[PDB]
Design a protein around this ligand. Structure first.
Ligand SMILES: *C(=C)C1=C(C)[C@@H](Cc2[nH]c(/C=C3N=C(/C=C4\NC(=O)[C@H](C)[C@H]4CC)C(C)=C\3CCC(=O)O)c(CCC(=O)O)c2C)NC1=O
Ligand SMILES: *CCC1=C(C)C(=O)N[C@H]1Cc1[nH]c(/C=C2\N=C(C[C@H]3NC(=O)C(CC)=C3C)C(C)=C2CCC(=O)O)c(CCC(=O)O)c1C
Ligand SMILES: *[C@@H](C)C1=C(C)C(=O)N[C@H]1Cc1[nH]c(/C=C2\N=C(C[C@H]3NC(=O)C(CC)=C3C)C(C)=C2CCC(=O)O)c(CCC(=O)O)c1C
Ligand SMILES: *[C@@H](C)[C@H]1/C(=C/C2=NC(=C\c3[nH]c(C[C@H]4NC(=O)C(C=C)=C4C)c(C)c3CCC(=O)O)/C(CCC(=O)O)=C2C)NC(=O)[C@@H]1C
Ligand SMILES: *[C@@H](C)[C@H]1/C(=C/C2=NC(=C\c3[nH]c(C[C@H]4NC(=O)C(C=C)=C4C)c(C)c3CCC(=O)O)/C(CCC(=O)O)=C2C)NC(=O)[C@@H]1C
Ligand SMILES: *[C@@H](C)[C@H]1/C(=C/C2=NC(=C\c3[nH]c(C[C@H]4NC(=O)C(C=C)=C4C)c(C)c3CCC(=O)O)/C(CCC(=O)O)=C2C)NC(=O)[C@@H]1C
Ligand SMILES: *[C@@H](C)[C@H]1/C(=C/C2=NC(=C\c3[nH]c(C[C@H]4NC(=O)C(C=C)=C4C)c(C)c3CCC(=O)O)/C(CCC(=O)O)=C2C)NC(=O)[C@@H]1C
Ligand SMILES: *[C@@H](C)[C@H]1/C(=C/C2=NC(=C\c3[nH]c(C[C@H]4NC(=O)C(C=C)=C4C)c(C)c3CCC(=O)O)/C(CCC(=O)O)=C2C)NC(=O)[C@@H]1C
Ligand SMILES: *[C@H](C)[C@H]1/C(=C/C2=NC(=C\c3[nH]c(C[C@H]4NC(=O)C(C=C)=C4C)c(C)c3CCC(=O)O)/C(CCC(=O)O)=C2C)NC(=O)[C@@H]1C
Ligand SMILES: *[C@H](C)[C@H]1/C(=C/C2=NC(=C\c3[nH]c(C[C@H]4NC(=O)C(C=C)=C4C)c(C)c3CCC(=O)O)/C(CCC(=O)O)=C2C)NC(=O)[C@@H]1C
Ligand SMILES: *[C@H](C)[C@H]1/C(=C/C2=NC(=C\c3[nH]c(C[C@H]4NC(=O)C(C=C)=C4C)c(C)c3CCC(=O)O)/C(CCC(=O)O)=C2C)NC(=O)[C@@H]1C
Ligand SMILES: *[C@H](C)[C@H]1/C(=C/C2=NC(=C\c3[nH]c(C[C@H]4NC(=O)C(C=C)=C4C)c(C)c3CCC(=O)O)/C(CCC(=O)O)=C2C)NC(=O)[C@@H]1C
Ligand SMILES: C=CC1=C(C)[C@@H](Cc2[nH]c(/C=C3N=C(/C=C4\NC(=O)[C@H](C)[C@H]4CC)C(C)=C\3CCC(=O)O)c(CCC(=O)O)c2C)NC1=O
Ligand SMILES: C=CC1=C(C)[C@@H](Cc2[nH]c(/C=C3N=C(/C=C4\NC(=O)[C@H](C)[C@H]4CC)C(C)=C\3CCC(=O)O)c(CCC(=O)O)c2C)NC1=O
Lengths: 250, 177, 34, 164, 164, 164, 164, 177
């Protein structure tokens, strides 16, 4: 056995951070590499806390089904984990524009002044704080059943604009709105989403009453600035429930 | 959802009655043959995927109009969904066989099936025939009376639980028709 | 999913809306007085 | 209504699956603890009167200031209500053994009761002085069997854990 | 993976609860079966070199077209990878005989299964020719105890009903 | 049904635009290249009674195991059933010939195709046994013209490559 | 830039499908149609300094209030910054010929152009009046061929309908 | 998430072999003290509402500079948060004692907890002092040697479980230090 001394690169995880010079360059890029991992624990802390209201007393609920046939549950996160690759594949202005859009919407539902600071500094938390609020207070499109044939037109009228930002300035398709990546996945997304739809209209009689007032409150708090804008939200809740947050493509 | 134990208390909380040993003799008579319940839940999942293949071919052989353009079970998409929902109602009635009583079948499967099976145009006479296949097949497994298969169970009296699951497909046929 | 207008195939809302229950309570009350 | 049944069949539903072996396995163990938690019911359902009789003065021997004016127990029907309210708690636990889970308490006594007691200005410490007496007024070999008394204490301290 | 306790400890993690008497009675079921169900798990371990020569040759003798060129079983050494997939899988049934549930079979033998067979022209009906014959070679008086046989058949036809 | 012109009047409907210069330039290709694929429509619809006949007997020549009991083709009532299924497949490719795109296949012969055959035990190898033979069976002057053979085959293997 | 082929590959990517015969037919109509619309591009590129001179002062003839003190074209540097914008829009309609669609106009010349002209007090009627003078002065058998003229004019009015 | 039983199969499948004789010896014994293991965690979850104040008032009364102005428990919102992380840690440790493996402990509770507390500014020394009281409380609750609560128990050994729960708390202390 020859006496192999430890490498000089292996020794460079044993030094002290000094300020003046190249030492600050490596000190910066390992701090924010770990500040990113703080947000991923910040975002996950509120993600399963809001999810903890969905399962109310330990028994699971019909809202949080992930599949209904044999292969239905397993194919879901193949779409999800590849969509996460498509989210961070965006450009600069698609990303910084979505940073400042959530900072305009998270700022107008924060109850605390600490909670305001938690959304400004950590952008992956301000994102999932919006998304978790719509899951528990069911103000998504995927939970809104329109109560009339005009509302099904009125909800269809607004998401034609919401789908219109899933395409670029010239009309070619963005990477955001996309329903498949492999042979047969896009058809499997269709047979998935109807079981969400049959169970969205399968709530109790006491929970349709709750999100009726909530989606009306959801539209007139974050998107409405005038009196007519809070008239379509008071009168047709599902039309206000389909108002997305403009950082998506769909 | 409720089980065979959340049935006795809801019929006492409506009268504010203490659950004493007057009606606890039937809960002592529930666990008495309580082995044979899950010794019957094994008798569905053991060959579950071939069950609806016996059903939908029995639906096609009895009513052969579904293969025509205009029959519901026509296309590869529309045969799939009938193959998809022939399983799903079998899954939920296995829960009602398991849980002791059918308060989960009437709350997560029948909650709006009768209206989406008239607003879509699904033939309710073949639908009650699809159920009528899978009611007579359960009593060929829970009584070990399959023609192409025997199953090793401890032999005894179990047919009171055979009429139990026969009381349950007569709750899903009594839902959509 | 999307609205019924575009990008979706089959029908929805197998749920008795608030007008739809008003017709049935009318009809049961009418068969009784009949 | 949480139990060993409705937990393994509701979680299995979200994955879209049949009863597995493990879902079958737990309800075998439901019959193993069955002979104890059944047995504690008819003693509680048989002599519920004297148990809630000793549960209410334990509110009062610690806090006799409730009989003051301006307080929670000033007239008779504010105390005649109170013996019934802990009776409802001592009847909820009889429902809580028979299902064998955290079923009846979490729906009918724990959900939102932090605002029922606060806005009506009831002392929430007066409730936990009552049920933390029957948890240790109870003998192990005399009251019931030694094994079923392990279950009976196991629910009262959960209710003690909840209101406090 | 999906055991008797990993579900019931995550069905209380999701609600943010502490594990109570529904979550604890579930593990009493992991004793009164696991005495019986572990009688067969190591019986599979000793004779595991003979079960693959029990079913894997009765497959090729019955579905005998597979030895022509233009098939998957055309050459000699590709047959060995088709023999390896029997003690890849009933290896996993021994692994799921010990962990109570079906978890290590689901993540490692069912998740991502059908996409590979449908691409590489591996007919899954010739898979179940071996396995449902292995399902019907269990001679439960001679082979093992009674109840560990129906804990061996039940994990076996879980694989027929999911390859199908 | 996806075609050459509904893939551009839907892409302009998505952006909320009027019909631009680009989408008209597409439908010009649905004049020149459209003439060949509708010429080939009369080749297939005129002799469809025998391309189901020269393909169904090739299924029972390569895979000769299906006539046995317990298989997919156990009797006569299912053999002609199998012969019937070949007739549907190029019927839709005649529909795809006149529509211009892959319209009546992705909705009718691809949508949920694999989920059906896996239940009733139908090999995708036996469905592509019919189609892959008749793909490179035709000779370019006799069956149709030269460039129509480029149209017919490139629509033929699409049903092969997606079912496999 | 939206063009003939970027939209059909982006609609095939957004469903995950391979390039079909639909997308392969849609470029057949790009081959014959390029042999017309190309011949306006080099024709305009060779003679652009005479078009924008005529099309420039045909704005200061229709509106001569622009040279009043306070308005857009008051001094000579502001007049030169008006002729340059005509030369910009002549480039982006030259680019739309060679790209094959409306792409380079509504990326660099239409998007946001409503808000710059409103803020900087530029009248958009003066922009469509300098474009429409070029659209009507177009001798269809002299300046180009027939089908090069139906394509060169089809972008000059898409720009007009954009700016109003 | 793994447990003790599913730890065996991964190491059995690290080297791709069966389960023979030499592996289930720590599993046939693991179900022997499993009946003690239910008696173990029934003691910890019966008192965690009483334990977390018994361990967060101790970290105040030792270092009273936390409730000073500018301290990390100063306002009434800071205190309510710190009373909740001490209930989360005592919730996830109680999972790992029932699982018999720390695989749940640093995928759902501890993975990234350190640099979360780095970015928040939660003092790392006063947090181990918070944790270790709950370690010294659980070992005095498992072996029934609390000062103020003696419970009814089957007589016998229990120090092996107190040895196991003492190995989980210092994983929390090591993960953030
Ligand atoms: C402040 C300076 C200060 C405290 C606050 C208090 C905290 C403390 N407690 C221990 C040891 C235990 N604490 C326990 C918790 C409880 N005891 C009970 O009996 C009830 C159920 C619960 C209160 C609701 C327990 C069980 C112990 C173990 C022994 C026992 O039987 O009580 C310590 C560490 C030990 C020490 O340092 O002496 C601390 C800091 N004590 C304070 O000094
Ligand atoms: C109500 C929503 C919820 C909570 C809370 C939770 O813990 N899990 C979901 C529902 C749920 N799902 C299962 C079982 C599975 N869930 C999935 C989906 C996962 N796969 C993914 O790619 C992602 C995105 C990160 C997730 C969440 C899968 C594949 C399964 C297993 C399917 C199988 O074949 O076993 C359960 C528990 C039941 C179980 O079997 O674990 C719950 C509550
Ligand atoms: C993203 C939101 C989209 C915009 C914007 C748009 O214009 N079109 C969307 C993307 C897109 N999707 C397809 C093709 C399919 N999409 C499918 C999913 C839908 N079908 C359903 O049943 C459901 C749930 C109810 C959904 C979302 C399916 C299926 C297809 C067909 C896949 C195939 O292989 O044929 C396309 C291509 C154009 C088209 O409509 O086919 C685009 C651009
Ligand atoms: C499939 C192999 C299953 C299986 C299923 C069982 N099916 C049973 C009875 C049954 N079978 C049919 C359809 C059959 N009869 C027909 O005339 C035609 C074709 C036109 C077919 C496919 C029906 C309608 C019924 C219901 C009762 C009846 O009418 O006979 C059955 C019970 C009897 C037995 O087989 O012993 C079983 C077990 N068997 C299996 O093992 C896999 C899972
Ligand atoms: C007396 C020593 C008690 C006490 C009792 C009071 N309870 C009062 C109101 C009240 N309490 C409950 C909860 C109880 N009733 C139930 O039905 C159930 C379970 C399902 C429980 C736990 C309810 C729902 C109500 C309102 C309706 C009612 O009057 O019963 C009350 C009156 C307060 C007021 O009216 O403002 C009293 C005095 N109060 C005490 O301090 C001790 C604990
Ligand atoms: C009646 C509605 C009209 C009229 C129609 C005719 N148009 C004729 C020919 C023609 N137009 C275009 C340009 C247009 N066709 C395209 O394919 C595209 C882009 C994809 C565009 C913008 C073309 C290319 C042609 C064909 C002749 C050529 O090579 O340029 C036409 C000629 C006869 C025919 O259709 O074959 C007629 C009658 N013409 C009229 O006078 C009235 C007003
Ligand atoms: C032999 C060439 C085949 C084969 C064919 C069989 N198919 C059987 C039943 C069957 N097939 C289909 C799909 C069919 N419907 C469609 O709409 C289309 C195309 C769009 C097709 C191909 C369905 C829906 C059914 C069930 C109803 C029916 O009988 O038609 C079948 C009988 C199976 C049985 O006994 O139940 C056979 C033999 N089988 C083979 O092995 C190769 C692949
Ligand atoms: C050390 C932590 C303790 C101690 C532990 C022991 N517990 C013993 C036995 C035991 N515990 C239970 C209850 C447990 N099993 C269940 O099924 C349920 C509820 C679902 C629970 C909470 C039972 C049933 C038993 C068996 C005796 C009985 O019939 O009660 C025990 C005996 C040996 C052993 O089981 O391995 C010990 C040593 N005992 C102590 O002295 C300290 C305080
Ligand atoms: C062998 C069992 C491994 C394997 C080893 C390779 N390591 C290579 C470079 C390298 N190795 C170490 C490890 C060692 N040196 C140290 O100073 C310390 C402690 C601080 C340790 C553990 C280090 C740090 C490095 C990078 C520094 C350097 O050598 O320049 C290496 C060369 C790869 C190449 O030629 O580019 C190999 C092959 N690789 C293997 O696959 C097996 C599993
Ligand atoms: C609503 C505010 C959003 C929206 C979100 C989407 N959710 C999608 C799938 C999905 N998300 C959840 C989590 C949900 N369950 C909970 O328990 C809680 C709170 C604790 C929440 C938010 C579930 C159960 C599911 C279904 C299973 C799955 O993940 O597939 C989803 C589709 C993504 C996908 O297919 O994977 C979206 C887009 N939907 C909206 O349109 C608004 C913006
Ligand atoms: C098959 C034996 C039937 C039959 C079934 C069809 N169902 C179709 C659509 C459909 N099916 C269900 C039932 C099921 N899916 C669920 O998710 C749930 C509960 C959660 C249940 C009970 C639903 C809800 C739907 C609508 C959603 C969907 O599109 O799948 C269908 C095709 C409709 C279409 O695509 O146009 C068929 C053919 N039809 C029959 O003839 C027999 C009796
Ligand atoms: C001439 C027909 C108009 C007129 C135009 C003026 N435009 C002035 C500035 C200006 N113009 C544009 C759009 C143009 N510039 C670009 O870079 C591109 C795309 C590549 C386009 C289409 C912009 C963005 C700007 C502002 C920045 C700049 O100075 O270049 C302008 C000067 C404004 C001023 O100095 O006050 C004039 C005068 N004026 C006319 O007389 C008619 C109305
Ligand atoms: C998790 C998996 C799991 C199971 C499947 C059951 C397995 C099971 N079944 C029975 C036992 C039995 N099972 C049946 C059931 C039947 N006998 C018949 O003739 C019919 C075919 C069928 C339904 C009527 C009968 C009649 C008995 C004996 C009655 C009794 O045990 O009291 C017993 C008690 C006797 C024994 O030790 O085997 C057990 C443990 N328990 C489990 O833990
Ligand atoms: C849509 C397109 C389309 C077709 C191509 C034909 C397909 C076709 N060709 C032949 C029949 C034939 N086809 C050929 C041609 C050839 N034989 C070969 O082996 C060579 C590869 C190739 C030379 C070019 C010959 C020589 C026959 C007659 C011999 C025979 O196949 O029995 C037959 C059987 C006889 C019959 O027509 O009934 C059929 C169905 N029909 C159609 O509808």
């Amino acid at each position: 056995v020859t006496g192999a001394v430890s490498s000089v690169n292996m020794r460079r995880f044993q030094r002290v951070p000094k300020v003046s010079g190249f030492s600050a360059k490596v000190t910066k890029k390992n701090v924010n590499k770990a500040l990113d991992k703080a947000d991923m624990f910040f975002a996950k802390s509120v993600t399963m806390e809001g999810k903890a209201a969905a399962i109310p007393y330990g028994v699971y609920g019909i809202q949080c089904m992930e599949g209904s046939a044999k292969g239905m549950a397993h194919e879901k996160r193949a779409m999800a984990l590849s969509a996460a690759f498509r989210m961070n594949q965006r450009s600069a202005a698609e990303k910084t524009g979505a940073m400042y859009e959530n900072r305009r919407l998270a700022l107008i539902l924060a109850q605390n002044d600490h909670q305001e600071k938690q959304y400004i500094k950590y952008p992956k938390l301000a994102a999932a704080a919006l998304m978790a609020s719509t899951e528990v207070t069911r103000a998504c499109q995927r939970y809104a059943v329109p109560e009339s044939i005009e509302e099904e037109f009125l909800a269809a009228s607004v998401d034609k604009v919401n789908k219109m930002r899933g395409t670029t300035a010239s009309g070619v398709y963005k990477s955001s709105c996309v329903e498949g990546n492999a042979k047969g996945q896009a058809e499997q997304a269709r047979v998935a989403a109807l079981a969400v739809a049959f169970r969205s209209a399968q709530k109790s009689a006491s929970q349709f009453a709750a999100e009726r007032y909530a989606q009306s409150k959801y539209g007139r708090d974050l998107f409405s600035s005038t009196h007519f804008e809070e008239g379509y939200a008071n009168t047709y809740p599902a039309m206000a429930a389909a108002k997305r947050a403009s950082s998506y493509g769909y | 959802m409720l089980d065979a134990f959340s049935r006795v208390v809801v019929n006492s909380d409506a009268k504010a009655a203490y659950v004493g040993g007057s009606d606890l003799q039937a809960l002592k008579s529930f666990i008495a043959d309580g082995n044979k319940r899950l010794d019957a839940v094994n008798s569905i999942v053991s060959n579950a995927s071939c069950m609806v293949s016996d059903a939908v071919s029995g639906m096609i052989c009895e009513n052969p109009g579904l293969i025509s353009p205009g029959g519901n079970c026509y296309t590869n998409r529309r045969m799939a969904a009938c193959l998809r929902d022939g399983e799903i109602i079998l899954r939920y009635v296995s829960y009602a066989l398991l849980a002791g009583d059918a308060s989960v079948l009437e709350d997560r499967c029948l909650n709006g099936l009768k209206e989406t099976y008239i607003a879509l145009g699904v033939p309710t006479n073949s639908s009650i025939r699809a159920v009528s296949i899978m009611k007579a097949q359960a009593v060929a497994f829970i009584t070990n009376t399959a023609t192409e298969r025997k199953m090793s169970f401890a032999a005894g009296d179990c047919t009171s639980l055979a009429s139990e699951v026969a009381s349950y497909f007569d709750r899903v046929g009594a839902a959509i028709s | 999913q999307t609205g019924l207008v575009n990008s979706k195939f089959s029908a929805r809302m197998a749920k008795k809306t608030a007008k739809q229950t008003k017709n049935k309570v009318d009809e049961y009350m009418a068969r009784s007085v009949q | 209504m949480k139990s060993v049944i409705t937990t393994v069949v509701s979680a299995a539903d979200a994955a879209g699956r049949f009863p597995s072996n493990s879902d079958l396995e737990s309800i075998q163990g439901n019959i193993q603890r069955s002979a104890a938690r059944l047995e504690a019911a008819e003693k509680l359902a048989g002599n519920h009167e004297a148990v809630v009789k000793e549960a209410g003065d334990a509110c009062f021997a610690k806090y006799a200031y409730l009989k003051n004016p301006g307080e929670a127990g000033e007239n008779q029907e504010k105390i005649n209500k109170c013996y019934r309210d802990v009776d409802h708690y001592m009847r909820l636990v009889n429902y809580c053994l028979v299902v064998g889970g955290t079923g009846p308490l979490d729906e009918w006594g724990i959900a939102g009761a932090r605002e029922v007691y606060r806005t009506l200005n009831l002392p929430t410490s007066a409730y936990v002085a009552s049920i933390a007496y029957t948890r240790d007024r109870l003998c192990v070999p005399r009251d019931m069997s030694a094994q079923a008394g392990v279950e009976f204490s196991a629910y009262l301290d959960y209710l003690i854990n909840a209101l406090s």
